[PDB]
Amino acid sequence: MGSMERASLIQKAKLAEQAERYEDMAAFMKGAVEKGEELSCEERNLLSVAYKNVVGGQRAAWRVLSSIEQGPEVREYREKVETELQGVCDTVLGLLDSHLIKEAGDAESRVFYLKMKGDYYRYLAEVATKKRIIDSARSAYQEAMDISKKEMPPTNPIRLGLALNFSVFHYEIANSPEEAISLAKTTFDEAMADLHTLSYKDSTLIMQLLRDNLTLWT
Amino acid sequence: MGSMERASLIQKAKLAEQAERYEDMAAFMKGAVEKGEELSCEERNLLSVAYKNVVGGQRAAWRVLSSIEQGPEVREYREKVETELQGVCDTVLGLLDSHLIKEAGDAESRVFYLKMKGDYYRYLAEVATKKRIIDSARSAYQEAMDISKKEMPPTNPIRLGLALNFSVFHYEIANSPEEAISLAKTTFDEAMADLHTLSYKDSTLIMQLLRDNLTLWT
Amino acid sequence: RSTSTPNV
Amino acid sequence: RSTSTPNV
Ligand SMILES: COCC(=O)CCCC(O)O
Ligand SMILES: COCC(=O)CCCC(O)O
């Protein structure tokens, strides 16, 4: 992508989105990141949509294959999918470390990137057998939580989505169901008290998911 | 794929189907074909399902992009998708020519392969501006029709699917709506008269599509 | 668009 | 399975 203009990469990422070509969309946004300028709010969202779709297809295949596994063929093909999944997560973590996080221009942007870092270590944790990977996920999420509580309102949709995901980490990955429940419940109650200030449609969608999970866990 | 056993390729193609990994499914079946033995009925169907899914995603993207097109970016990205589509159709035609068609063991199998040849020249025709490509599609379909009328019953689902597709060729590609209508109508009437001999569920599904198209065209 | 054989 | 943030 090095010979194509930054503006052209961003335009083609939007075309690939409309066409449902998510592998191409991700390659175009990686090219744009490596140009070295800071991303706008619409550009961060393109980068997130592209990789989440690619890694989402790989996770749903790994789970079908793990379930079949319970002749070396099933184990071989499951390991193949697993290594491609790991390559995608390691490419994203490399972009965030080099140098999106360090160069971010404000709180809103730095929180978005640290949430992404926690999400991609968490996807690595799902297929590992590791304690170190879980410790890296927890630490990225905790740094994002600390900044967001000081710099953004309780209804901001990135603050809310960050709390939802850190809650799922506690319940599904780190075996702390008490911590997941308490976080989800405190998060929902504080956003509820702040609705009157909305902006209002964005927040209520993630609140609903917090409540759904509470019902399941409780 | 040259170092993997034929039985292992076929097993992994079935795993990739369950996991919805159609690009991997196609690579495994190409490996199996290049081992050089004749395919069974279940193996021909795996090969068809894999490539039809890959080329189906590419056709739906090309049509979204052509519609946007109506700055060089849209034209460049549409040409990129178009060349990948052409590479997939040329790989399939190469398998059929080398040597699935020539080595087929009977009528049922030879008709399946000549129908596939007509279908992949037709997909090339949709993006060309060509008369030669249309002449190659028509000729593969006509040879399949001649064999099937002599060797299979009017209700056989490959004979029916072949007639449905040759009808769509006449209407959408070769501008002969009279020929499409007459073929669809003669095909439906002759299968109807033969239902009492079913096997019965397989045929009625393609008959329904013949009727749907007749309603549209008429 | 006309319909062709589906991918069973 | 618990639900995480959807891909807007
Ligand atoms: C860093 O992850 C990005 C994110 O959560 C996108 C926001 C989705 C929400 O509006 O449903
Ligand atoms: C050579 O193309 C193969 C084909 O038509 C598969 C049969 C599908 C039909 O049973 O709905």
XYZ file of C-alpha atoms and ligand atoms in Angstrom:
474
model
C 0.000 0.000 0.000
C 3.081 2.236 0.226
C 2.708 3.732 -3.292
C -1.032 4.774 -2.778
C -2.161 8.199 -1.423
C -3.594 8.226 2.180
C -6.922 9.789 0.852
C -7.264 7.020 -1.785
C -6.746 4.211 0.896
C -9.474 5.715 3.079
C -11.883 6.009 0.039
C -11.220 2.350 -0.941
C -11.746 1.170 2.647
C -15.305 2.691 2.425
C -15.964 0.968 -0.966
C -14.822 -2.426 0.493
C -17.170 -1.941 3.465
C -20.194 -1.440 1.058
C -19.110 -4.523 -0.933
C -18.634 -6.695 2.254
C -14.972 -7.343 1.434
C -13.560 -7.171 4.985
C -10.057 -8.640 4.344
C -9.444 -5.906 1.650
C -10.965 -3.217 4.028
C -8.414 -4.216 6.719
C -5.473 -4.127 4.324
C -6.479 -0.598 3.144
C -6.786 0.747 6.793
C -3.403 -0.812 7.803
C -1.882 1.100 4.808
C -3.545 4.309 6.040
C -2.282 3.833 9.625
C 1.343 3.273 8.395
C 1.292 6.727 6.693
C 1.938 8.042 10.216
C -0.723 10.770 10.705
C -3.306 10.745 13.629
C -6.733 9.221 12.884
C -10.057 11.075 12.964
C -13.181 9.594 14.714
C -14.653 8.205 11.410
C -11.178 6.630 10.511
C -10.836 4.855 13.999
C -14.263 3.385 13.438
C -13.341 2.081 9.920
C -10.171 0.391 11.369
C -12.209 -1.222 14.185
C -15.080 -2.479 11.881
C -12.579 -4.082 9.391
C -10.518 -6.113 11.939
C -13.489 -7.066 14.107
C -15.241 -8.679 11.091
C -12.042 -10.572 10.062
C -11.309 -11.868 13.577
C -15.053 -12.548 14.179
C -15.169 -15.067 11.209
C -12.027 -16.792 12.472
C -13.356 -17.136 16.088
C -16.679 -18.670 14.919
C -14.759 -21.225 12.734
C -12.287 -22.144 15.632
C -15.305 -22.860 17.905
C -17.072 -25.162 15.357
C -13.770 -27.095 14.897
C -12.926 -27.300 18.674
C -16.425 -28.726 19.237
C -15.920 -31.404 16.521
C -12.487 -32.303 18.016
C -14.056 -32.563 21.506
C -6.864 -39.659 12.694
C -4.968 -36.335 13.006
C -7.094 -34.244 10.496
C -9.446 -32.320 12.842
C -6.558 -31.329 15.180
C -4.373 -30.263 12.182
C -7.072 -28.058 10.589
C -8.068 -26.485 14.001
C -4.368 -25.585 14.610
C -4.227 -24.017 11.107
C -7.192 -21.766 11.864
C -5.799 -21.001 15.343
C -2.406 -19.797 13.927
C -4.146 -17.436 11.359
C -6.318 -16.010 14.194
C -3.121 -15.411 16.224
C -1.435 -13.678 13.246
C -4.407 -11.232 12.882
C -4.421 -10.348 16.634
C -0.604 -9.861 16.579
C -0.827 -7.500 13.481
C -3.436 -5.274 15.301
C -1.455 -5.185 18.603
C 1.608 -4.149 16.496
C -0.272 -1.130 15.021
C -1.458 -0.034 18.474
C 2.117 -0.311 19.906
C 3.671 1.360 16.849
C 2.608 4.081 17.457
C -1.167 4.770 17.700
C -1.341 4.697 21.549
C 1.781 6.774 22.223
C 0.866 9.515 19.660
C -2.860 9.833 20.483
C -3.902 13.538 20.715
C -6.436 13.394 23.600
C -8.421 11.151 26.079
C -11.272 10.146 23.746
C -8.721 8.665 21.267
C -6.341 7.098 23.825
C -9.256 5.271 25.573
C -10.497 3.903 22.142
C -7.006 2.414 21.445
C -6.496 0.934 24.975
C -9.957 -0.707 24.786
C -8.863 -2.263 21.374
C -5.610 -3.534 23.053
C -7.601 -5.275 25.862
C -10.055 -6.802 23.245
C -7.274 -8.386 21.061
C -5.313 -9.863 24.060
C -8.694 -11.266 25.235
C -9.209 -13.054 21.802
C -5.660 -14.513 22.150
C -6.608 -15.719 25.677
C -9.650 -17.652 24.387
C -7.361 -20.054 22.420
C -4.303 -20.192 24.815
C -3.592 -22.828 27.550
C -1.386 -17.607 28.846
C -1.688 -16.496 32.456
C 0.676 -13.831 31.032
C -1.744 -13.049 28.149
C -4.614 -12.591 30.679
C -2.465 -10.228 32.771
C -1.768 -8.070 29.588
C -5.526 -7.864 28.745
C -6.439 -6.833 32.397
C -3.809 -4.118 32.476
C -4.792 -2.452 29.132
C -8.515 -2.472 30.278
C -7.604 -0.992 33.759
C -5.584 1.894 32.212
C -8.492 2.665 29.842
C -10.961 2.589 32.810
C -8.849 5.013 34.887
C -8.616 7.670 32.099
C -12.294 7.371 31.147
C -13.586 7.879 34.678
C -11.596 11.163 34.910
C -12.202 12.536 31.332
C -15.552 11.458 29.771
C -19.243 11.364 30.859
C -20.811 8.083 32.170
C -23.024 8.006 29.099
C -20.215 8.262 26.448
C -20.640 5.142 24.200
C -16.871 4.262 24.159
C -16.794 4.416 28.066
C -19.910 2.222 28.146
C -18.585 -0.298 25.498
C -15.282 -0.481 27.409
C -17.128 -1.373 30.675
C -19.319 -3.992 28.910
C -16.207 -5.766 27.457
C -14.110 -5.620 30.720
C -17.192 -7.204 32.418
C -17.260 -10.079 29.853
C -13.420 -10.505 30.430
C -14.048 -10.920 34.227
C -16.857 -13.496 33.732
C -15.635 -15.647 30.742
C -11.835 -15.389 30.954
C -10.661 -14.621 34.451
C -13.216 -16.642 36.502
C -14.384 -13.699 38.646
C -18.164 -13.671 38.352
C -18.606 -11.295 41.476
C -16.377 -8.612 39.787
C -18.328 -8.939 36.413
C -21.758 -8.513 38.135
C -20.680 -5.533 40.299
C -19.070 -3.695 37.353
C -22.047 -4.255 35.070
C -24.534 -3.083 37.750
C -22.556 0.086 38.820
C -22.059 0.985 35.094
C -25.788 0.711 34.191
C -26.972 2.716 37.313
C -24.568 5.647 36.712
C -25.508 5.956 32.982
C -29.235 5.843 33.869
C -28.819 8.919 36.201
C -27.151 10.850 33.339
C -29.593 10.186 30.419
C -31.439 13.526 31.000
C -28.333 15.291 29.609
C -28.493 13.674 26.129
C -26.545 11.101 22.036
C -29.495 9.449 23.808
C -29.919 6.683 21.211
C -26.197 5.848 21.140
C -26.033 5.045 24.911
C -29.296 3.054 25.376
C -28.128 0.354 22.947
C -25.111 -0.728 25.086
C -27.172 -0.346 28.323
C -29.545 -3.004 27.031
C -26.646 -5.492 26.619
C -25.469 -4.749 30.147
C -28.956 -5.715 31.423
C -29.088 -8.884 29.179
C -25.815 -10.140 30.657
C -26.958 -9.352 34.240
C -30.082 -11.506 33.683
C -27.956 -14.414 32.435
C -25.369 -14.290 35.264
C -27.813 -13.804 38.103
C -1.550 -29.834 -1.260
C 0.780 -32.286 -3.022
C 2.198 -33.823 0.199
C -1.321 -34.576 1.746
C -3.242 -37.879 1.255
C -6.350 -37.724 -1.058
C -8.592 -39.064 1.849
C -7.294 -36.333 4.215
C -8.053 -33.515 1.603
C -11.623 -34.767 1.207
C -12.094 -34.946 5.065
C -10.748 -31.367 5.474
C -12.988 -30.078 2.671
C -16.003 -31.335 4.759
C -14.656 -29.640 7.955
C -14.202 -26.310 6.043
C -17.788 -26.557 4.754
C -19.128 -26.884 8.399
C -16.936 -23.932 9.461
C -18.044 -21.735 6.453
C -14.460 -21.377 5.217
C -15.137 -21.577 1.457
C -11.721 -20.385 0.136
C -9.990 -23.212 2.164
C -12.726 -25.732 0.994
C -11.899 -24.868 -2.655
C -8.155 -25.224 -2.157
C -8.650 -28.693 -0.552
C -10.924 -29.935 -3.468
C -8.469 -28.609 -6.135
C -5.749 -30.690 -4.343
C -8.043 -33.742 -4.452
C -8.817 -33.285 -8.176
C -5.055 -33.020 -9.041
C -4.461 -36.496 -7.494
C -5.858 -37.781 -10.804
C -8.573 -40.294 -9.767
C -12.295 -40.017 -10.902
C -14.699 -38.260 -8.502
C -17.698 -39.861 -6.788
C -21.155 -38.118 -6.671
C -20.569 -36.693 -3.116
C -17.033 -35.398 -4.207
C -18.442 -33.581 -7.392
C -20.946 -31.874 -5.147
C -18.223 -30.715 -2.664
C -16.169 -29.234 -5.595
C -19.255 -27.416 -6.957
C -20.389 -25.999 -3.517
C -16.843 -24.637 -2.743
C -16.282 -22.712 -6.035
C -19.868 -21.497 -6.342
C -19.653 -19.822 -2.890
C -16.261 -18.193 -3.731
C -17.386 -16.881 -7.135
C -20.827 -15.914 -5.698
C -19.182 -13.456 -3.161
C -17.052 -11.941 -5.920
C -20.050 -11.425 -8.309
C -22.143 -9.674 -5.603
C -19.179 -7.314 -4.804
C -18.535 -6.520 -8.586
C -22.234 -5.535 -8.953
C -22.227 -3.164 -5.906
C -19.041 -1.490 -7.286
C -20.291 -1.268 -10.948
C -23.449 0.423 -9.623
C -21.399 2.999 -7.632
C -19.204 3.674 -10.724
C -22.346 4.122 -12.877
C -11.101 10.481 -9.297
C -9.901 7.034 -10.487
C -10.543 5.054 -7.192
C -13.910 3.357 -7.915
C -12.760 2.206 -11.399
C -9.413 0.919 -9.971
C -11.029 -1.114 -7.152
C -13.780 -2.538 -9.502
C -11.027 -3.695 -11.942
C -9.187 -5.343 -9.001
C -12.265 -7.352 -8.043
C -12.964 -8.145 -11.719
C -9.432 -9.626 -12.268
C -9.736 -11.904 -9.120
C -13.170 -13.107 -10.364
C -11.568 -13.897 -13.756
C -8.703 -15.812 -12.069
C -11.214 -18.039 -10.149
C -13.259 -18.841 -13.317
C -10.029 -19.610 -15.262
C -8.767 -22.012 -12.458
C -12.099 -24.001 -12.593
C -12.157 -24.167 -16.441
C -8.530 -25.470 -16.232
C -9.574 -28.372 -13.927
C -12.472 -29.304 -16.221
C -10.171 -29.262 -19.321
C -7.373 -31.108 -17.499
C -8.795 -33.729 -17.402
C -12.174 -34.133 -15.614
C -14.336 -33.966 -18.801
C -12.194 -36.253 -20.969
C -11.829 -38.973 -18.249
C -15.444 -38.997 -16.989
C -16.724 -42.609 -16.563
C -20.375 -42.219 -17.692
C -23.193 -39.783 -18.809
C -24.314 -38.620 -15.349
C -20.741 -37.383 -14.607
C -19.947 -35.943 -18.065
C -23.202 -33.870 -18.063
C -22.355 -32.486 -14.521
C -18.917 -31.273 -15.789
C -20.227 -29.761 -19.092
C -22.943 -27.874 -17.150
C -20.110 -26.475 -14.853
C -18.137 -25.412 -18.015
C -21.171 -23.471 -19.398
C -21.767 -21.822 -15.915
C -18.146 -20.494 -15.548
C -17.946 -19.103 -19.160
C -21.326 -17.430 -18.417
C -19.831 -15.681 -15.262
C -16.896 -14.481 -17.450
C -19.461 -13.135 -19.980
C -21.221 -11.010 -17.327
C -18.070 -8.825 -16.904
C -16.723 -8.863 -20.549
C -17.359 -6.230 -23.305
C -16.553 -11.572 -25.456
C -18.784 -12.581 -28.347
C -16.230 -15.443 -28.319
C -16.828 -16.104 -24.579
C -20.623 -16.296 -25.218
C -20.072 -18.767 -28.076
C -17.971 -21.037 -25.687
C -20.731 -20.982 -22.994
C -23.497 -21.866 -25.603
C -21.508 -24.766 -26.992
C -20.712 -26.424 -23.595
C -24.470 -26.105 -22.619
C -25.631 -27.576 -26.029
C -23.319 -30.634 -25.710
C -24.600 -31.238 -22.152
C -28.245 -30.917 -23.385
C -27.723 -33.447 -26.210
C -26.259 -36.172 -23.903
C -28.858 -35.622 -21.170
C -31.842 -35.959 -23.488
C -30.519 -39.376 -24.660
C -29.258 -40.775 -21.268
C -31.201 -39.486 -18.205
C -34.896 -39.096 -17.197
C -36.671 -35.681 -17.559
C -36.931 -35.505 -13.786
C -33.178 -36.024 -12.997
C -32.129 -32.928 -10.927
C -28.845 -32.331 -12.887
C -30.841 -32.408 -16.250
C -33.364 -29.989 -14.729
C -30.665 -27.630 -13.223
C -28.852 -27.651 -16.586
C -32.064 -26.557 -18.417
C -32.804 -23.821 -15.820
C -29.271 -22.312 -16.253
C -29.214 -22.544 -20.126
C -32.602 -20.701 -19.989
C -31.102 -17.883 -17.830
C -28.116 -17.730 -20.344
C -30.609 -17.191 -23.255
C -32.543 -14.425 -21.415
C -29.779 -12.434 -19.556
C -26.685 -12.967 -21.724
C -27.580 -13.746 -25.300
C -30.674 -11.500 -25.749
C -33.007 -14.303 -26.899
C -36.061 -14.058 -24.665
C -38.250 -16.329 -27.043
C -35.672 -19.204 -26.718
C -35.532 -18.804 -22.829
C -39.377 -18.940 -22.488
C -39.817 -21.945 -24.833
C -37.042 -23.958 -23.131
C -38.329 -23.228 -19.638
C -41.931 -24.157 -20.590
C -41.048 -27.440 -22.472
C -38.739 -28.451 -19.543
C -41.408 -27.921 -16.824
C -44.198 -29.767 -18.818
C -42.060 -32.880 -19.506
C -40.924 -33.197 -15.831
C -44.542 -32.790 -14.635
C -45.639 -35.839 -16.774
C -42.866 -37.947 -15.171
C -43.357 -37.166 -11.419
C -45.474 -40.348 -10.876
C -42.241 -42.366 -11.283
C -40.432 -40.815 -8.272
C -36.443 -38.480 -5.863
C -39.752 -36.577 -5.859
C -38.546 -33.843 -3.484
C -35.290 -33.286 -5.393
C -37.069 -32.419 -8.705
C -39.934 -30.183 -7.432
C -37.470 -27.628 -6.033
C -35.952 -26.727 -9.459
C -39.426 -26.888 -11.126
C -40.565 -24.090 -8.837
C -37.707 -21.832 -10.059
C -38.614 -22.586 -13.664
C -42.169 -21.338 -12.941
C -40.870 -18.216 -11.028
C -38.776 -17.174 -14.029
C -41.683 -17.800 -16.463
C -43.881 -15.434 -14.395
C -41.209 -12.718 -14.510
C -40.508 -12.973 -18.272
C -44.105 -13.217 -19.396
C -32.766 -10.780 -11.771
C -33.748 -14.264 -13.015
C -32.920 -17.152 -10.622
C -30.324 -19.896 -11.494
C -29.768 -23.229 -9.718
C -29.074 -22.807 -5.986
C -26.039 -24.049 -4.245
C -27.269 -27.169 -2.466
C -22.373 -16.912 25.717
C -22.297 -13.392 27.218
C -22.636 -10.523 24.686
C -19.774 -7.998 24.010
C -19.988 -4.679 22.137
C -21.388 -5.072 18.604
C -19.635 -4.021 15.505
C -21.381 -0.782 14.570
C -12.520 0.165 20.576
O -13.768 -0.585 20.193
C -14.686 0.255 19.475
C -16.189 0.284 19.864
O -16.652 -0.062 20.970
C -17.110 0.775 18.756
C -18.334 1.330 19.422
C -19.483 0.391 19.201
C -20.700 0.926 19.970
O -21.109 2.220 19.490
O -21.771 0.005 19.769
C -22.973 -28.642 -12.205
O -23.775 -27.810 -11.240
C -24.240 -28.595 -10.130
C -25.721 -28.505 -9.672
O -26.667 -28.102 -10.378
C -25.957 -28.950 -8.235
C -27.386 -29.398 -8.149
C -28.175 -28.383 -7.378
C -29.650 -28.810 -7.383
O -29.841 -30.079 -6.733
O -30.384 -27.816 -6.670
